Amino acid sequence: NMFEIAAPNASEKTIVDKLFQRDTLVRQSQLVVDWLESIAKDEVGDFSDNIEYYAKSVYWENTLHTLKQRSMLSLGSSRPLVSELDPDAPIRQKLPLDDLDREDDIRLLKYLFTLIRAGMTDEAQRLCKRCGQAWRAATLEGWKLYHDANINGGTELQAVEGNPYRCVWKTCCWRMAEDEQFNKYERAIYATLSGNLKQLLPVCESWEDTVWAHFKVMVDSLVEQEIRA
Amino acid sequence: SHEDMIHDAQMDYYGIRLATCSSDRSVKIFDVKNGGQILIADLRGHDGPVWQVAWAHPMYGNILASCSYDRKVIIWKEENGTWEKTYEYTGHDSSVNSVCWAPHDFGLVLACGSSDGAISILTFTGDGPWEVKKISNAHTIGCNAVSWAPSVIPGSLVDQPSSQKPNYIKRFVSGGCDNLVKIWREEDGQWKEDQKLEAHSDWVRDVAWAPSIGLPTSTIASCSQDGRVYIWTSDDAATNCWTPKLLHKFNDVVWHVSWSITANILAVSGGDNKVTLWKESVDGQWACISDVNK
Amino acid sequence: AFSHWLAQTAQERIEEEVSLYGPERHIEAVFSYLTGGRISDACRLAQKSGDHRLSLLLSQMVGSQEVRDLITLQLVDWNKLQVDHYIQEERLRVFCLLSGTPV
Amino acid sequence: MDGEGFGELLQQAEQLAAETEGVTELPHVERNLQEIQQAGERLRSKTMT
Numbered sequence: 070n071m072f073e074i075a076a077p078n079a080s081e082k083t084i085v086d087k088l089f090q091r092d093t094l095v096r097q098s099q100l101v102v103d104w105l106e107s108i109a110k111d112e113v114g115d116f117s118d119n120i121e122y123y124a125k126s127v128y129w130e131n132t133l134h135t136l137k138q139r140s141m142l143s144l145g146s147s148r149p150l151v152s153e154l155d156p157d158a159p160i161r162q163k164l165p166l167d168d169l170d171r172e173d174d175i176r177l178l179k180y181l182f183t184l185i186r187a188g189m190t191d192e193a194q195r196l197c198k199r200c201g202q203a204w205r206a207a208t209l210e211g212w213k214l215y216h217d218a219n220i221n222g223g224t225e226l227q228a229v230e231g232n233p234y235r236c237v238w239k240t241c242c243w244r245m246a247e248d249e250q251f252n253k254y255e256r257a258i259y260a261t262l263s264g265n266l267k268q269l270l271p272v273c274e275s276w277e278d279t280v281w282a283h284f285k286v287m288v289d290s291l292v293e294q295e296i297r298a
Numbered sequence: 299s300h301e302d303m304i305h306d307a308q309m310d311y312y313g314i315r316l317a318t319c320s321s322d323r324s325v326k327i328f329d330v331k332n333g334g335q336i337l338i339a340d341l342r343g344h345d346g347p348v349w350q351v352a353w354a355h356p357m358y359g360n361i362l363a364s365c366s367y368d369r370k371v372i373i374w375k376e377e378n379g380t381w382e383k384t385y386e387y388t389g390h391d392s393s394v395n396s397v398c399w400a401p402h403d404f405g406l407v408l409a410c411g412s413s414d415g416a417i418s419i420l421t422f423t424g425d426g427p428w429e430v431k432k433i434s435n436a437h438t439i440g441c442n443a444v445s446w447a448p449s450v451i452p453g454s455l456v457d458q459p460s461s462q463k464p465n466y467i468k469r470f471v472s473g474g475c476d477n478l479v480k481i482w483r484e485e486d487g488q489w490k491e492d493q494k495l496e497a498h499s500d501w502v503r504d505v506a507w508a509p510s511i512g513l514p515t516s517t518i519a520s521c522s523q524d525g526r527v528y529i530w531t532s533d534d535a536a537t538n539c540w541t542p543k544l545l546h547k548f549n550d551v552v553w554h555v556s557w558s559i560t561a562n563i564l565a566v567s568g569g570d571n572k573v574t575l576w577k578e579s580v581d582g583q584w585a586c587i588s589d590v591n592k
Numbered sequence: 593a594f595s596h597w598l599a600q601t602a603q604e605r606i607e608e609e610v611s612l613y614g615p616e617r618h619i620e621a622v623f624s625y626l627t628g629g630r631i632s633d634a635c636r637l638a639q640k641s642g643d644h645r646l647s648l649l650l651s652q653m654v655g656s657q658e659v660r661d662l663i664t665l666q667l668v669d670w671n672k673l674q675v676d677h678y679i680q681e682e683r684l685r686v687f688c689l690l691s692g693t694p695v
Numbered sequence: 696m697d698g699e700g701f702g703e704l705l706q707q708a709e710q711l712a713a714e715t716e717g718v719t720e721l722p723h724v725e726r727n728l729q730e731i732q733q734a735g736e737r738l739r740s741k742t743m744t
Binding site: 117124125126127130134191194195198199 | 726731741
């Protein structure tokens, strides 16, 4: 009883679960991915309780205190800094940021980068709401699709998840990748969310990582093919 | 030629081009052949007086870095017969004083210390980013001299075949102007405290890693302003076996130490307008085998 | 149908303030684009200008309720942080628009 | 089967723990006041900077 056919008549999650059920090749691809990432999460374990001791919750504290003293003292500083807290404040402004700031950043980038190379998403929002990158946690949501089934009962939550602008939004990320100029972490995560082979080359070098990426890319390309189909 | 006397001047791996840097505000370059030589260039750029450059390993090609008083490090790569200004860094409060390339086994990363009291270490992908490894409070006062880890030296590698590649832990050494010397190892993504050394009650000027090819041990020639030249040696840092020995009691402020390209002997600049040529004799002791009157 | 109506209506408004504004006035353009719900051409503009962070923000405008939980706690944090005194209320009104906070 | 009086206390504890875990700042991504403790004491550290 393999493979099916239909036309759009209801919420796109119908499309989704049809697509999941119909094909074999993607099915074993999904299972081997579950294998590898089960490996990953077994490696993870209690990184939750272990980050209890990695924590800092002051945004760009060094730039904070130094601009404070520039405004605060007889003498300021001869050092350029952002006037903005924006996640793109420096590079948009080309303005520098402090090393301790950026490097505790890189540290949390290891944390969550690993967490999401494993996909450890609960811990992902955990770390977001630790360090106050709720903006970044928002950025995390651009790909997860949309649904609702409240065609029943009272006005009750069946799904409210996200913005249905996601196909074009991945296209936008695709072109951002073609634009480059990224940190390793953002480069990897969104070249991943795009399955972009060349910009996924830098970070995956292991046997497991390269086969993993093979499966990721091919599963994506397939899945979007029968999305449009 | 140069308007000011030369601090440093280095030939290539192949003996066929010479870079010559003074504090004369620019650095001039000759091709080298047949005993003859043509000044192929004089690179400008350095808005601070220049002291030091840094050539890179040949399997990478031809790479030079330079420090200046302006807190600027200029980074030069040679094309088609043309060396040119490829990367340049500033952000420093005091003149960048020490730059030195790492072994190609570790890669294309330069070490960059200044008397700022803190030090950065900068990686070039060779085509890509300049990865920054900045360590603050590296000194309570400032950084004078720094040396890397040379990548391969005897002591445990006799049983390690040539076909395989061993783990490359990063370490290095340096001495500053807080009257102290210090030793660093790299881990967790950063560097932490191998060793603190307080024997020269005065500022250390230059530091010399004995290229310990044939040596299980770890050997240092430390020269300070106080006229004391310490051979610091440990067979094992884990058993903490660093010991001082006198090499020579020069009565001048003791200045510079540099091992041979042949990795055999040491040249020591003294407060005498001389460079003493010392060799650890075959027996047990350090003998000034020659001299060059600067 | 109301949305398609507003789409018809705001055409000339967009055509008028578009001559008015620019990447200098880009947050004012953000306000206009939010008032339109015209995420499509907003994103197209942001990309033709290479405005990647802003473009990513654009999708979040009508994300899940969790987006707004994020913004509530995040802005409570900025309140405890006093950063507003150092940040123009321009992006801040963008933030109010995203967060559903009118005042 | 039997022991429903004890199952009552079991579900009481389950719902009290559900409160303790969904609210009261404890596990599964709750805003832990400990990190605000961090923020305030780092303010103090910036004060003695």
